Amino acid sequence: NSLLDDAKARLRKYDIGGKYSHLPYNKYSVLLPLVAKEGKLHLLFTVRSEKLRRAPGEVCFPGGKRDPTDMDDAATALREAQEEVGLRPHQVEVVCCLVPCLIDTDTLITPFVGLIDHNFQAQPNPAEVKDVFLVPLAYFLHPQVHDQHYVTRLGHRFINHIFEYTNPEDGVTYQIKGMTANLAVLVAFIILEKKPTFEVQFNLNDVLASSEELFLKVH
Amino acid sequence: NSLLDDAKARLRKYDIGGKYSHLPYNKYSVLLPLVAKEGKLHLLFTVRSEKLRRAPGEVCFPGGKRDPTDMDDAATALREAQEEVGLRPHQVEVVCCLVPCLIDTDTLITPFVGLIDHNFQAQPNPAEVKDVFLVPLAYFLHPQVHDQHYVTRLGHRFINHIFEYTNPEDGVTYQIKGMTANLAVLVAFIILEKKPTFEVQFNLNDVLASSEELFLKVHK
Amino acid sequence: NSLLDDAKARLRKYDIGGKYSHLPYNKYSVLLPLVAKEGKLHLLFTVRSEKLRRAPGEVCFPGGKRDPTDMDDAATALREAQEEVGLRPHQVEVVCCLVPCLIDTDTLITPFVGLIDHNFQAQPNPAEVKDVFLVPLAYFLHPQVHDQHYVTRLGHRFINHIFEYTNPEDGVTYQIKGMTANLAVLVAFIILEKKPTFEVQFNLNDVLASSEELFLKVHKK
């Protein structure tokens, strides 16, 4: 079995399908894209352009607002990823839908995890993406540069991470934070099963149940 | 080349905008694209995405915010046109930089007029453009659906046009208004020289000087 | 981004931009494309097609003749780079216009330095480019295969370099010479500041002044 075949195996146990579809919120989807490169797994990220209303300049996963013409939440993740980085449908296999996050009182973000084909080459769309980059999956469990702080908001205490990663190939440094960082850490732990060198939001011995309770406590 | 050659010739007299390229406003460029179809000139328009901060959903010319890495205002026009509708540098000849427009006290739009090659085919970028369409140039001097209102922006009374155009190919109707509509009427008159069926902001017998004087007035 | 930003800072001082852009020569622009790979800076080169009138088969930077429809010299450099290797405007930041070069008494080349995005992938246009390749920037100051000779041209004594570089990945070997080699050495010195293992046309302790003085000598004569 390949690196991505092993990931699919661990991710399947956490797929909750459509359990949290049809909820009365404004809907956004994101796609977490897993890439095998040089003998290990990485996650692909985007940097949003300045001209966007929502979250300009921020580091995020590919994705966006659910359009009235999209058939469902998964279709949104796939279309937005094609528009932002050139990913075609045959180049990604969606293997997991995760418990969603509420960024607002009104806004629900639904996350999908996708296995990315090895012959895919990113093509950033400069209309809405300033940059596209990779980070090794293991970095989110054993980082060289990382800080974190509690923020009760609201109520219940969440954890704000800030990861800093420098790509040795081209010398550019990126910061990954907020909901994007929470998701990277969760999926990294699911796939690699190593305890992080820091405290996390969820229960390491009870990942799925604690994840749902967390959402319900804000829903 | 005739049909575009004539337009270049008439536009030449009005090319003076570079003269204002160094005023420290928040700067944007637009490109007015002239296209030949069925023997006559048309203007090309875009419909902006809802995603965007500025003017989501509205009809406008291709263009955008001048980037710090752009070399000058015309480079902004060209790059944005490529990003929005797929127009490449060899497919357009820029032949005029017009007197700019203040959209508020801190923001300035520099307009460029470009002649478009007959083998160009639009490819709307769905990240920032919902639709792309053509309107005959003569329609802005002799429209079948048009209205006007007086609005007082930045200190003195301006005319706000509202045009409506239905494409007979598919039955889709578009609305063109505000600055976009002002610039379309001006360029149509410069090229076609037919007195419109309605009142306009500039002096029909003194187009260049009238236009400049208006700009200089609101700048002070 | 460290590597590209440090290059930008050093190139700043040499951006004698615009000054010579109005001299009525037959005008060409070139773009010097700086690329980060494997931790270090590289220069991107093209090999021109045979069917071209000017300099068929030769190794050079992307670029070409100023068209009557180009707005200015920078615009020429950007358009030609897109036509030749597929480089789009958002994938390059132009950070320097250098002192120009006369290749004859009637023809003037204006060089621009550009920082290239890491997601750019070259797409050679076979109508005018036979090949596209990289050379590490440090190679032009510390080469392993290199020779040079004085050449007296347009009134004064230039240096003609011949660099030879073999790409370990594919085993292809390239020769870089003439004006292209002079520009590569200068930009490498500006950015890395290592004194070369050979003689150069400019003053190592007075780069900007010696450069600008040389052009004015040839232009006057």
Q: What is C50-114 written as a DSSP string?
A: TT-SSSTT-EE-SEEEPPTT-SSHHHHHHHHHHHHH---GGGEEEEEEPPPEEEETTEEEEEEEE
Which of these, C38, C80, C36, lies nearest to C61 by C-alpha position? C80
| CA pseudo-torsion sign C91, C94, C95, C96 | positive
Which of these, A135, A114, A134, lies nearest to A124 by C-alpha position? A134
Residues B150 and B190 sit within 8 Å (Cβ to Cβ): no
Which of these, A23, A8, A7, lies nearest to A215 by C-alpha position? A23
Residues B100 and B17 sit within 8 Å (Cβ to Cβ): yes
Contact A169 C3 (CB under 8 A): no
| CA pseudo-torsion sign C93, C99, C102, C106 | positive
B159 DSSP β-pair partners: B150
Phi first, then psi: give them for residue A216, nearest 5 degrees. Answer: -65, -35
Residues with Cβ within 8 Å of C146's Cβ and at least 6 positions away in sequence, in order, are: C161, C162, C163, C164, C197, C198
Quote the CA–CA distance of A3 and A5 in Å, as a whole number: 6
Nearest-CB residue to A53 (from B53, B83, B125)? B53
Q: Which residues of A touch B (CB under 8 A)?
A: 50-54, 56, 64-65, 83-84, 125-128
The radius of gyration of chain B's CA atoms, rounded to the nearest angstrom, is 16
Tokens, residue B171: 């039955």
Residue of C nearest to B90 (CA): C79
Nearest-CB residue to C71 (from B74, B88, B90)? B74
Phi first, then psi: give them for residue B53, nearest 5 degrees. Answer: -65, -50
Residue of C nearest to B67 (CA): C90
Residues A197 and A185 sit within 8 Å (Cβ to Cβ): no
Which of these, C162, C145, C159, lies nearest to C199 by C-alpha position? C159
B-interface mutation test, from C1, C71, C76, C123, most B Cβ less than 10 A away:
C71
- The residue ranges of DSSP E strands in B61-219, in sequence order, are 63-65, 92-97, 101-102, 107-116, 129-136, 146-153, 156-166, 173-177
The radius of gyration of chain A's CA atoms, rounded to the nearest angstrom, is 16
Chain B residue numbers touching A50 (CB-CB < 8 A)? 65
Q: Which 8-state DSSP code applies to residue B212? A: H
Contact A83 B54 (CB under 8 A): no
Which of these, C123, C108, C129, lies nearest to C47 by C-alpha position? C129
CA distances for C185 relative to C40, C51, C95, C146, angstroms: 16, 29, 18, 12
Residues C114 and C38 sit within 8 Å (Cβ to Cβ): no
C75 in the Ramachandran plot: left (φ > 0), alpha (ψ -120 to 50) or beta? alpha
Which of these, A207, A217, A216, lies nearest to A96 by C-alpha position? A207
Chain A touching partners, 3 or more CB pairs below 8 A: B, C
Quote the CA–CA distance of C19 and C12 in Å, as a whole number: 15
B94 DSSP β-pair partners: B114
A55 in the Ramachandran plot: left (φ > 0), alpha (ψ -120 to 50) or beta? left
| CA pseudo-torsion sign B74, B79, B80, B85 | positive
- Helices then strands (H, E): number in chain C? 4, 11
Residue A14: strand, helix, or coil: helix
Contact C121 A121 (CB under 8 A): yes
Residue of A nearest to B81 (CA): A127
Residue pairs spanning B and C at CB distance below 8 A: 32
Burial readout B122-152 (b: 16 or more C-beta within 10 A, e: otherwise): bebbbbbbeebbbbebebbbebeebeeeeee
In a 10 Å sphere around its CB, with 0-12 CB exposed, 13-18 middle and 19+ buried, how is residue C193 labelled? exposed
Cα angle A111, A115, A120; round to 5: 115
Contact C118 A173 (CB under 8 A): no
Question: C80 labelled as ligand-binding?
Answer: yes
Compute CA C131 distance to the chain's CA centroid, rounded to the nearest angstrom: 16
Tokens, residue C14: 């040499």
Contact A56 B51 (CB under 8 A): no
Chain B residue numbers touching C74 (CB-CB < 8 A)? 71, 75
Residues with Cβ within 8 Å of B24's Cβ and at least 6 positions away in sequence, in order, are: none
Residues B199 and B19 sit within 8 Å (Cβ to Cβ): no
Quote the CA–CA distance of A126 and A111 in Å, as a whole number: 24
Phi first, then psi: give them for residue A196, nearest 5 degrees. Answer: -70, 160
CB hemisphere CA count around C195 (13 angstroms)? 4
Residue type (1 letter), C159? I
Contact A170 C119 (CB under 8 A): no
- The residue ranges of DSSP E strands in chain A, in sequence order, are 26-37, 40-48, 59-60, 63-65, 92-97, 101-102, 107-116, 129-136, 145-152, 157-166, 173-177
Which of these, C66, C162, A152, lies nearest to B89 by C-alpha position? C66
In a 10 Å sphere around its CB, with 0-12 CB exposed, 13-18 middle and 19+ buried, how is residue A156 labelled? exposed
- The residue ranges of DSSP E strands in B6-91, in sequence order, are 26-37, 40-48, 59-60, 63-65
| Distance in Å, alpha carbon of A99 to nearest chain C alpha carbon | 33
| Distance in Å, alpha carbon of B125 to nearest chain A alpha carbon | 8
Residue pairs spanning A and B at CB distance below 8 A: 32
CB hemisphere CA count around B219 (13 angstroms)? 14
End-to-end CA distance of chain A: 39
Q: Which 8-state DSSP code applies to residue B60? A: E
Q: In terms of residue numbers, what domain contains C196? A: 1-221
Residue type (1 letter), C69? T
Residues with Cβ within 8 Å of C117's Cβ and at least 6 positions away in sequence, in order, are: A131, C90, C91, C92
Residue B141: strand, helix, or coil: coil
Domains identified in chain B, total number: 1
Chain C residue numbers touching A164 (CB-CB < 8 A)? none
In the block, which residue shows the tokens 């931009």? C17
Chain C residue numbers touching A171 (CB-CB < 8 A)? 1-4, 36, 39
Which of these, C89, C90, C83, C72, lies nearest to C17 by C-alpha position? C72
Å resolution of this model?
Answer: 2.0
